[PDB]
Amino acid sequence: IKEMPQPKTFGELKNLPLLNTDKPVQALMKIADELGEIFKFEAPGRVTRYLSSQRLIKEACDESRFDKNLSQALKFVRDFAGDGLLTSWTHEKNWKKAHNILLPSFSQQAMKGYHAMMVDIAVQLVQKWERLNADEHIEVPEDMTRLTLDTIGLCGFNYRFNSFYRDQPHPFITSMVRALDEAMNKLQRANPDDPAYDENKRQFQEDIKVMNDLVDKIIADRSDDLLTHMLNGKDPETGEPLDDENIRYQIITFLIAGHETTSGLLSFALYFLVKNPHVLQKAAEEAARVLVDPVPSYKQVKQLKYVGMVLNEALRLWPTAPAFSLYAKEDTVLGGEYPLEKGDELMVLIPQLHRDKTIWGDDVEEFRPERFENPSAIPQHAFKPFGNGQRACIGQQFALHEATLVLGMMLKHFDFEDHTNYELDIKETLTLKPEGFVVKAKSKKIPL
Amino acid sequence: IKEMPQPKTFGELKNLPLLNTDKPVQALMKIADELGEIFKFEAPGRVTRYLSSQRLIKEACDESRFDKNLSQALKFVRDFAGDGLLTSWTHEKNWKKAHNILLPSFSQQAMKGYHAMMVDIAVQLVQKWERLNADEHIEVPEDMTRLTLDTIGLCGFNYRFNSFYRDQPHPFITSMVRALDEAMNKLQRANPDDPAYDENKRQFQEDIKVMNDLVDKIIADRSDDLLTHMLNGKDPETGEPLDDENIRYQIITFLIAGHETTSGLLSFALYFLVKNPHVLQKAAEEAARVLVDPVPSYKQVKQLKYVGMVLNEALRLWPTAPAFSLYAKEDTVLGGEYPLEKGDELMVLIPQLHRDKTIWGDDVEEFRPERFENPSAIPQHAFKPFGNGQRACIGQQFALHEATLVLGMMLKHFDFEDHTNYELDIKETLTLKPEGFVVKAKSKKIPL
Ligand code: HEM
Ligand code: HEM
Ligand SMILES: O=C(CCCCCn1ccnc1)N[C@@H](Cc1ccccc1)C(=O)O
Ligand SMILES: O=C(CCCCCn1ccnc1)N[C@@H](Cc1ccccc1)C(=O)O
């Protein structure tokens, strides 16, 4: 029956000012480093627990005892993502309904239809880099966001964002960033509903309307894609199709979740490749011998075994959706020593779980794709970059196929140079990105 | 589209008399030296191809194009190991069932439970050697077989073979070797059903009963061991447990596969250590500074890094499981030059693969454990002592932990003398062992 550690407090604000930082996940990682596998985190009106060990997290992942909770971050996303898949509770009727309607369009069998459109965008990336002048460099996270946003727009909605025709991000993508910044400032204000913050909310509500015109644009224009299955698919359970309002929420949901975490993964993957040249050589050799055609096929992408190992090891060190939240379904005991009451919340700190030395050994900080050479050797719930159970990431296969195809084409067509000796700087939104990561790519002059 | 080399033929017997030798693997190695990275081998009613280069074998290890095949040796082992893990086809229902049920028993949590029993047997080895009189020598493969068989009996079935109390191998072990000898004599026979081999077959069915009754003995007695997880574990996929028939086959499977290859590895490791005194010194120094307790801990064993490199380097030169077999799942082309039809089989000649000068350099024949410092530096599929893919050795980590623990205790407690200047003579069963290898051990007088 153990007493739970807790980091330094700030009076009546409890632990909340600890999140008043521009790198909160990294700050939470440092706390778990000091306090261990579990620590209590308190805010005015809020208590949660951050789990860091596979021993405890494998228990939290028991779906009979814990269900998905909406963290404060997810409650803020809910303000425009509604009861879409990511921000609905499991007991809301629209979750299981949209889940049943939408899993068919994310199966491995469904990936074959998306592949051609994924290659369309990937070719646009390769041509951009091959058209650079000598000594021009690449802004990696920016170009990966161009790719993944264009890919989800094309594959999901048959809509072309045409990001590679833009030097500056879309207003839709710029507006998001303004909204989240206001979201995190509202926490540290004792009186957020003050008459004095109308100017803060005045610009904030404009961005919510900003997105709805694109959705009307996307719907009215309308193939075998995500948007098709939402208008014509019917839930087998209730026999019902999604209603128009929920359709709009899913489109908003898939546009965000469908691109940002995947561009982070690709950016971290390339960073680790240029910092570990032996791994890069190994990955480039596989890409060269497998991608024998000017355009990769679906089956050729499945053959990029080591590329996928690279992606998994990048996901281990820096899982770009760095946490998910749970609540206790009934009174229970965690680890035989931590009693929890019904409704008590948990946070799973994914980067800390993935650094569990009793699971991965002492070299947790080294980038070694060889950990994933045999997938069966990984214990249950030791590797959770895509969440857990029925609330796990519905886009997992989509993301990994897109990222394997794109990274394979990059390794086949260019040699990469870390010409600035880039010092990793992890920018934090609700996801993780290596900020300022730049490389030089020298074409191998292989035609498309 | 290249025409495939082939060794000398014997009329209607094709290449089969080339295997009428007591060192067939070494004979195949010599053919590979003359003919190169691939050669065809023909027998009455059978054709296969032996691969020797990482270039071709990296293609053969593609599980989308090739699956595990049962060689003639494995089909003969199947005659008493049934559909146990080693001799079942991947499409047989019992393979995946037993694979799913038994993988937990080779997890890190299971190694931690086996560790104490491994120490029990290792201490018996150290005590035997310290109890020798002056100028007495050690019969290395014999004592390594005593250790590995006792270890799998204890860790797998909570059964004590008590090999260190025996002056001659167990009759269960004598029958095994006699059975295989008849199998390899049955290979050269034109008329196997000739009545002149009735006396030969009479002992084969007697030896099978010898082994199955030992299984009864182990069964009748029946903890945290393999047999537990076989009787109480049930497959997550089908929800079913193994039936009694398959349990008996797994017990037979694990008794053989669980010890013979590992005692070969330990024997080759000690041979290479005493022939390379600088390597011996470095490994003995690591053993001294890490094994600070009278009993090694589990964590201390993971910390014997150079001992592990020694084991890997012994596995490179003399992989004690010297081959595995594959068949083409569909029509395919190997190396852009050798077309294969669906069902065509391949053999991977592991000792030759590990001598590929384009991978390891020109000093392939030298014993240098430093080759294995960085696994990321080793090209893909260059090092295959444990097989490939989902049909890779399930006991791999079990074997490496046992051999690292035992080799570390040997280096800590004794100085070793190659007093006969032993000439390596590799005996061949289905595995490889250094025959007649003897050393003298001078105790360092460190208590247990
Ligand atoms: C590329 C296309 C992607 C799409 C379309 C997508 C979409 C989604 C959706 C709709 C959900 C909620 C599903 C539900 O609860 O029913 C979800 C969950 C989740 N996804 Fe993704 N995602 C993508 C990529 C990724 C990537 C690359 C990662 C990790 C690096 C990731 C991590 C997660 C996590 C952790 C959750 C669980 C969130 C929670 O438990 O609160 N996703 N995803
Ligand atoms: C020490 C305990 C060991 C046990 C219990 C064990 C057991 C097994 C089993 C059950 C399989 C078949 C797995 C499957 O197909 O699902 C297997 C495969 C294999 N093992 Fe082991 N083994 C051990 C040690 C070793 C060692 C030391 C080596 C190499 C020196 C080795 C080499 C192999 C190879 C090459 C295969 C693949 C065989 C093929 O593809 O036909 N094993 N082992
Ligand atoms: O830890 C986190 C980060 C989780 C963000 C994940 C968002 N994601 C998931 C999938 N794609 C995006 N969020 C806590 C912080 C907090 C704790 C206590 C009190 C106030 C705030 C929360 O939101 O509650
Ligand atoms: O090369 C080999 C040796 C394979 C031994 C592997 C035994 N092992 C593996 C894991 N634990 C034991 N075997 C061929 C020989 C042959 C070729 C052509 C025609 C007839 C016979 C075969 O058996 O088919």
**Secondary structure in 3-state letters for B173-190:** HHHHHHHHHHHHHHHCCC
**Residue of chain B whose alpha carbon sits nearest to that of A273:** B376
* Ligand nearest to C-alpha B265: 2
- Helix ranges restricted to H, B61-92: 72-81
- B421 at A interface, C-beta within 8 A: no
**Residue of chain B whose alpha carbon sits nearest to that of A360:** B108
- From residue B140, alpha-carbon distances to B277, B318, B414, B424, B438 in Å are 18, 16, 14, 13, 6
First to last CA, chain A: 64
From A393, A414, A416, A431, the catalytic residue: A393
DSSP state for residue B65 in the 8-state scheme: T
From B87, B261, B262, B404, the catalytic residue: B261
Q: Which residues of chain A neighbour B374 with C-beta distances below 8 Å?
A: 278
Asked if A332 and A298 count as a contact pair (C-beta separation under 8 A), the reply is no
3-state secondary structure chain A: CCCCCCCCCCHHHCCHHHHCCCCHHHHHHHHHHHHCCEEEEEECCEEEEEECCHHHHHHHCCCCCEEEECCHHHHHHHHHHCCCCCCCCCCCHHHHHHHHHHHHHHCHHHHHHHHHHHHHHHHHHHHHHHCCCCCCCEEHHHHHHHHHHHHHHHHHHCCCCCHHHCCCCCHHHHHHHHHHHHHHHHHCCCCCCCHHHHHHHHHHHHHHHHHHHHHHHHHHHCCCCHHHHHHHCCCCCCCCCCCHHHHHHHHHHHHHHCCHHHHHHHHHHHHHHHHCHHHHHHHHHHHHHHCCCCCCCHHHHHCCHHHHHHHHHHHHHCCCCCEEEEEECCCEEECCCEEECCCCEEEEEHHHHCCCHHHHCCCCCCCCHHHHCCHHHCCCCCCCCCCCHHHCCCCHHHHHHHHHHHHHHHHHHEEEECCCCCCCCEEECCCEEECCCEEEEEECCCCC
Of B108, B376, B397, the CB nearest to A282: B376
Number of A to B CB contacts under 8 A, please give it.
33
Which residues, numbered 243 to 302 in chain B, qualify as contacts with chain A under a Cβ-Cβ cut-off of 8 Å?
302
**Resolution of this entry, Å:** 2.1
Asked if A104 and A110 count as a contact pair (C-beta separation under 8 A), the reply is yes
Q: Please enumerate in sequence order all residues whose Cβ is within 8 A of that of A6, keeping only pairs 6 or more positions apart, or say none.
A: A15, A35, A39, A40, A41, A42
B443 — phi, psi (to 5°)?
-65, 140
Residue B414's DSSP bridge partners are: B443
**What is the B386 CA–ligand 2 centroid distance (Å)?**
6
Tell which residue, B315, B283, B267, has the closest CA to residue B411: B283
3-state secondary structure A232-296: HCCCCCCCCCCCHHHHHHHHHHHHHHCCHHHHHHHHHHHHHHHHCHHHHHHHHHHHHHHCCCCCC
Known catalytic membership, residue A261: yes
Asked if B156 and B225 count as a contact pair (C-beta separation under 8 A), the reply is yes
Q: Do A303 and B375 touch (CB under 8 A)?
A: no
Tell which residue, B274, B313, B258, has the closest CA to residue B118: B258
Q: Which residues of chain A neighbour B337 with C-beta distances below 8 Å?
A: none
Ligand 1 atom with the smallest distance to the CA of A95 is 16
Known catalytic membership, residue A41: no
Of B62, B375, B397, the CB nearest to A368: B375
Asked if B94 and B246 count as a contact pair (C-beta separation under 8 A), the reply is yes
Would you tell me how many other CB atoms lie within 10 Å of the CB of residue A271? 22
Q: Which residues of chain A neighbour B302 with C-beta distances below 8 Å?
A: 361-362
CA angle A258, A262, A266 (to 5 degrees): 160
Identity of the amino acid at B355: R
DSSP state for residue B340 in the 8-state scheme: E
Q: Whose CA is nearest to atom 31 of ligand 2?
A: B386
DSSP state for residue B234 in the 8-state scheme: B
Q: Whose CA is nearest to atom 6 of ligand 4?
A: B323
Known catalytic membership, residue A386: yes
Burial of A65-90, coded b for 16+ CB within 10 Å and e otherwise, reads bbbbbbbebbebbbebbbbbbbbbee
